[PDB]
Amino acid sequence: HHHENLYFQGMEGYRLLYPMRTYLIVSGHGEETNVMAADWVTVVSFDPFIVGVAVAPKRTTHKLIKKYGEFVISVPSLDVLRDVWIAGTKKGPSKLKEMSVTLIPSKKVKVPSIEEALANIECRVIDARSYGDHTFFVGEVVGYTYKDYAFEKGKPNLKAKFLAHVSWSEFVTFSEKVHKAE
Amino acid sequence: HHHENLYFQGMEGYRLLYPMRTYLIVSGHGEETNVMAADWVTVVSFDPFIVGVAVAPKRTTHKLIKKYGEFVISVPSLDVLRDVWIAGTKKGPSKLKEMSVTLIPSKKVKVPSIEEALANIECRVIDARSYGDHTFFVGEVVGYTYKDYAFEKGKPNLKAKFLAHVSWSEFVTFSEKVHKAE
Numbered sequence: 001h002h003h004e005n006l007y008f009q010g011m012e013g014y015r016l017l018y019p020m021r022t023y024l025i026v027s028g029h030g031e032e033t034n035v036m037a038a039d040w041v042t043v044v045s046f047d048p049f050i051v052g053v054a055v056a057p058k059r060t061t062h063k064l065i066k067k068y069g070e071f072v073i074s075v076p077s078l079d080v081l082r083d084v085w086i087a088g089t090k091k092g093p094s095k096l097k098e099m100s101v102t103l104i105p106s107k108k109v110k111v112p113s114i115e116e117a118l119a120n121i122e123c124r125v126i127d128a129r130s131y132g133d134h135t136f137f138v139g140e141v142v143g144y145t146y147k148d149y150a151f152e153k154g155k156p157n158l159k160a161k162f163l164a165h166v167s168w169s170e171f172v173t174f175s176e177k178v179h180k181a182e
Numbered sequence: 183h184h185h186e187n188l189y190f191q192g193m194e195g196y197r198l199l200y201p202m203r204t205y206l207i208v209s210g211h212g213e214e215t216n217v218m219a220a221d222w223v224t225v226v227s228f229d230p231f232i233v234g235v236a237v238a239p240k241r242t243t244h245k246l247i248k249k250y251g252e253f254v255i256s257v258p259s260l261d262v263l264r265d266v267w268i269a270g271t272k273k274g275p276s277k278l279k280e281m282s283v284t285l286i287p288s289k290k291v292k293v294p295s296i297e298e299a300l301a302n303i304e305c306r307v308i309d310a311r312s313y314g315d316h317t318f319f320v321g322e323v324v325g326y327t328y329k330d331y332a333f334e335k336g337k338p339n340l341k342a343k344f345l346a347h348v349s350w351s352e353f354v355t356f357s358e359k360v361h362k363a364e
């Protein structure tokens with residue numbers, strides 16, 4: 001498989017950063033609630049806590065983030081891969097009927113959270129910049145929830161099976177073997 | 183351990199996105215060549231290939247990226263953890279004497295590449311935005327090199343031991359067990 005619009009066949013340059021974590025991005029609310037898959041997510045500030053996500057203009061998610069100015073980063077486990085794949089292949093709110101997700105209210109944003117997620121990070125858009133073929137939406141974190149066990153020791157519990165993306169349809173989780181640097 | 187300037191003790195919010203990949207950021211050149219550790223790295227565009235990295239103003243790396251307008255993202259393996267830890271704990275160019283790294287010329291930028299890295303992604307700064315306590319440096323990718331075996335099948339070779347960060351001094355790599363979504 002290759003990314004769409006790869007005119008010169010070869011490995012996509014971005015693959016040099018892989019494997020990357022895979023998250024879900026929830027946008028909209030009510031009948032407009034949507035979810036997509038997103039790898040291109042990072043933290044951009046500690047205090048205040050701010051995150052960013054690169055979203056192509058053609059995503060339905062892009063329209064919904066522009067319209068409402070809010071999004072939720074929901075953290076999936078490997079056990080919900082089938083739902084992550086639907087989120088990353090089907091288009092728009094009608095896909096939710098196909099997904100094993102239970103929408104629950106957020107603490108602060110109007111966009112819902114996903115009950116099955118390991119964490120839900122509630123974001124308000126503070127910037128949108130166009131870089132190449134994506135918009136980088138920067139979100140101030142205004143709330144969050146998480147599954148106690150997934151972060152039981154004030155750090156990620158590797159038993160929770162955090163999801164990473166290797167290539168097109170190939171995913172993995174982490175080893176449970178921790179290496180200490182100090 | 184907690185991040186510096188965590189006034190209210192508890193798990194840092196950003197930890198909800200962890201584990202995250204750990205990269206190295208090379209900046210400067212000559213006697214000013216520097217390397218630091220960076221987790222807060224993502225892709226922001228496919229075509230053209232553009233990346234971003236969140237760097238605190240207090241990093242020596244910040245000064246060097248501002249001065250020269252270029253940086254290299256070098257991808258470490260778990261086998262070079264000791265060097266990654268020096269990059270992420272010591273300050274400025276004098277740390278290189280302590281690291282098992284061989285600097286080699288980049289293809290395009292003046293900042294050197296690291297021979298031992300799995301990949302070296304050469305970047306020219308196209309934007310710098312302040313979000314909270316970090317600058318988000320956005321870099322257009324103008325060249326790259328990589329170890330053939332690490333990406334042998336036009337995708338990451340999990341045998342290469344790509345590095346991820348769990349908590350302060352704790353690191354892991356990926357399982358080699360691939361899950362197919364399609």
Ligand SMILES: Cc1cc2nc3c(=O)[nH]c(=O)nc-3n(C[C@H](O)[C@H](O)[C@H](O)COP(=O)(O)O)c2cc1C
Binds near residue numbers: 022038054055088089
């Ligand atoms: C694992 C995976 C990761 C993805 N990461 C991104 C991403 O970071 N940004 C993006 O714009 N699209 C990404 N996509 C593509 C969207 O998830 C996909 O186009 C989705 O169908 C869009 O749905 P929507 O139109 O309902 O927003 C990803 C897809 C997959 C399968």
Ligand SMILES: Cc1cc2nc3c(=O)[nH]c(=O)nc-3n(C[C@H](O)[C@H](O)[C@H](O)COP(=O)(O)O)c2cc1C
Binds near residue numbers: 240
């Ligand atoms: C694994 C790890 C990841 C890190 N990620 C970041 C990061 O994304 N951004 C940042 O500004 N500092 C990050 N740091 C902190 C810098 O690497 C660290 O402060 C380093 O000593 C700065 O070196 P310098 O002053 O030579 O630039 C990280 C540190 C470690 C150990």
Ligand SMILES: NC(=O)c1cccnc1
Binds near residue numbers: 003039040056228
């Ligand atoms: N173009 C994209 O945004 C993208 C990112 C990761 C996987 N597939 C597509």
Ligand SMILES: NC(=O)c1cccnc1
Binds near residue numbers: 185222
């Ligand atoms: N403040 C930071 O930039 C940072 C990121 C990851 C680990 N330690 C510090």
